[PDB]
Design an enzyme around this catalytic site. Sequence first.
Site, short mmCIF file in Angstrom:
data_model
loop_
_atom_site.label_atom_id
_atom_site.label_comp_id
_atom_site.label_asym_id
_atom_site.label_seq_id
_atom_site.Cartn_x
_atom_site.Cartn_y
_atom_site.Cartn_z
N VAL A 74 -32.93 -66.81 -86.01
CA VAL A 74 -34.17 -65.66 -85.65
C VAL A 74 -33.47 -64.22 -84.62
O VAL A 74 -33.73 -63.09 -85.26
CB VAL A 74 -35.31 -65.93 -85.70
CG1 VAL A 74 -36.41 -64.73 -84.55
CG2 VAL A 74 -35.92 -67.46 -85.95
N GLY A 75 -32.58 -64.79 -83.91
CA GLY A 75 -32.17 -63.79 -82.70
C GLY A 75 -31.66 -64.23 -81.62
O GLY A 75 -31.49 -65.48 -81.38
N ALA B 179 -30.15 -62.34 -74.06
CA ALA B 179 -29.20 -62.91 -72.93
C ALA B 179 -28.55 -63.87 -72.13
O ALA B 179 -27.81 -64.26 -71.78
CB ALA B 179 -28.89 -61.58 -71.92
N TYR B 180 -30.11 -65.37 -72.39
CA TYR B 180 -30.28 -66.01 -71.19
C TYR B 180 -30.54 -67.39 -72.61
O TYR B 180 -30.65 -68.37 -72.30
CB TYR B 180 -31.54 -66.31 -70.76
N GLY B 181 -30.57 -66.86 -74.07
CA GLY B 181 -30.44 -67.90 -75.12
C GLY B 181 -29.91 -67.50 -76.26
O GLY B 181 -30.50 -66.33 -76.35
N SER B 182 -30.27 -68.62 -77.39
CA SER B 182 -30.27 -68.45 -79.37
C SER B 182 -31.32 -69.20 -79.53
O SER B 182 -32.10 -69.99 -78.74
CB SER B 182 -28.72 -69.46 -79.23
OG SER B 182 -27.88 -68.15 -78.97
N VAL B 183 -32.48 -68.42 -80.53
CA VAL B 183 -33.44 -69.04 -81.20
C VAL B 183 -33.24 -69.30 -82.68
O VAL B 183 -32.46 -68.24 -83.22
CB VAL B 183 -34.85 -68.41 -80.57
CG1 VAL B 183 -35.56 -68.99 -81.98
CG2 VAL B 183 -34.67 -68.02 -79.32
N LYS C 34 -35.45 -73.04 -79.03
CA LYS C 34 -34.81 -72.04 -77.99
C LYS C 34 -33.63 -73.17 -77.46
O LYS C 34 -34.49 -74.18 -76.56
CB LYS C 34 -35.96 -71.11 -76.96
CG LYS C 34 -34.88 -70.16 -75.61
CD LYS C 34 -36.35 -69.97 -74.95
CE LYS C 34 -35.52 -68.86 -74.14
NZ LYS C 34 -36.73 -68.52 -73.27
N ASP D 84 -43.39 -65.32 -73.04
CA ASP D 84 -42.06 -65.02 -72.54
C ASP D 84 -42.72 -64.73 -70.47
O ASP D 84 -42.91 -63.68 -70.26
CB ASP D 84 -41.76 -63.72 -72.68
CG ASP D 84 -40.72 -64.30 -74.27
OD1 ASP D 84 -40.82 -65.46 -74.56
OD2 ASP D 84 -40.75 -63.20 -74.60
S1 LIG Z 1 -42.05 -69.14 -81.24
C1 LIG Z 1 -41.62 -66.99 -80.18
N1 LIG Z 1 -41.24 -67.47 -78.88
C2 LIG Z 1 -41.40 -68.09 -78.30
C3 LIG Z 1 -39.65 -68.60 -77.92
C4 LIG Z 1 -39.64 -69.95 -76.82
C5 LIG Z 1 -39.83 -69.87 -75.67
C6 LIG Z 1 -39.61 -71.10 -74.84
C7 LIG Z 1 -39.66 -72.11 -75.54
C8 LIG Z 1 -38.85 -71.98 -77.41
N2 LIG Z 1 -39.02 -71.01 -77.83
N3 LIG Z 1 -41.92 -65.61 -80.60
C9 LIG Z 1 -41.54 -65.41 -81.29
C10 LIG Z 1 -40.87 -64.57 -82.43
C11 LIG Z 1 -40.82 -63.07 -82.24
C12 LIG Z 1 -42.05 -61.97 -82.64
C13 LIG Z 1 -43.33 -63.30 -81.81
C14 LIG Z 1 -43.12 -63.97 -81.09
C15 LIG Z 1 -41.38 -62.92 -80.53
#
Ligand SMILES: S=C(NCCc1ccccn1)N[C@@H]1C[C@H]2CC[C@@H]1C2
Length: 348
Positions: free
Chosen positions: A26-27, A30-34, A49, A164
């Site tokens: 998904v993207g 600089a502190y991780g990949s998702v 993450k 975040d």
């Molecule tokens: S589920 C999500 N962020 C959680 C990231 C994370 C943070 C900590 C642990 C695991 N994953 N972000 C969506 C993707 C972008 C569009 C809407 C939001 C921003």
Amino acid sequence: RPTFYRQELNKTIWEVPERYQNLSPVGSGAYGSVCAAFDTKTGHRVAVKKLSRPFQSIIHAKRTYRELRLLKHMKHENVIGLLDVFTPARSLEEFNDVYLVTHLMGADLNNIVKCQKLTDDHVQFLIYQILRGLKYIHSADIIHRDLKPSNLAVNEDCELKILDFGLARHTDDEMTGYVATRWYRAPEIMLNWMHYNQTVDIWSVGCIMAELLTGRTLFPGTDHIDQLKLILRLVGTPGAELLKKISSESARNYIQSLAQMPKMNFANVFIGANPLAVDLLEKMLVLDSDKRITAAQALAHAYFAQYHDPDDEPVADPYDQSFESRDLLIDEWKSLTYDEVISFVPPP
Ligand SMILES: S=C(NCCc1ccccn1)N[C@@H]1C[C@H]2CC[C@@H]1C2
Ligand SMILES: [Cl-]
Ligand SMILES: [Cl-]
Ligand SMILES: [Cl-]
Ligand SMILES: [Cl-]
Ligand SMILES: [Cl-]
């Protein structure tokens, strides 16, 4: 211990339990990949993450511990919630990688506000949920510090989660010029006036609420100084009482160079808005942070009469942040993080 399988995803090796299927990038900050995935155990589309270089320095190791402590604590409808944390390591000795799991969110406030039509009823419900989440965060003496539209997840039904958290990550360059990264920041933290506290988050809620009502950024400054001039034109130049609370002499010296301006009439700025929305903005957007409305006070304001339920606005368990003043070696922070990975208990 589950069984793990390996796969390469955009130049990166991922080793995850078999329960997690159909991984797709998904993207990457600089502190991780998702990656997005399907969780066969819960049946949720999950966001996973993976941390980059979690133990590369003392600063990075302590940040990894801070992020895991914070995410393991937060159990509220309107805040990010942890489903899982894992490492493929079978001992402390081979421990190098940390993976975090959350229920998937497909969009932010920017996606749903710009590209849709918001009634006053939509603004009431979205701001109510932010303040419900903030009451919970602030009751644990946690400060978010980075509330802005891109850090608020929103679904088809207008249901909202804060994510975040500020982990003390933002650099000088990231805050420079015409940038959304600075437009939602309280003036005391943007210019380092004084020791800040949880009131900085209420300033950010005011800037977000104005933008949902008008469809425009409240203080879109071209730099730190242009932004301060936009702020002081709306709320007025500081009086003697606030100037005394600015510990920086050079900051005090600069503010006193500016011609005095009175506070503007908010009914003439937010033309046509619900008078109760105007009244709440006047109580959030106060220059002296001591005098701002709190999240608990705002939930009882008449603007939220439709949604307010004092028996369904819960507070957090106590949160011990004594580690923040502790001086430890890389391997000591890494050992503390390992212990928090192996003690994790999933939600029901
Ligand atoms: S589920 C999500 N962020 C959680 C990231 C994370 C943070 C900590 C642990 C695991 N994953 N972000 C969506 C993707 C972008 C569009 C809407 C939001 C921003
Ligand atoms: Cl599994
Ligand atoms: Cl969640
Ligand atoms: Cl590992
Ligand atoms: Cl944003
Ligand atoms: Cl604790």
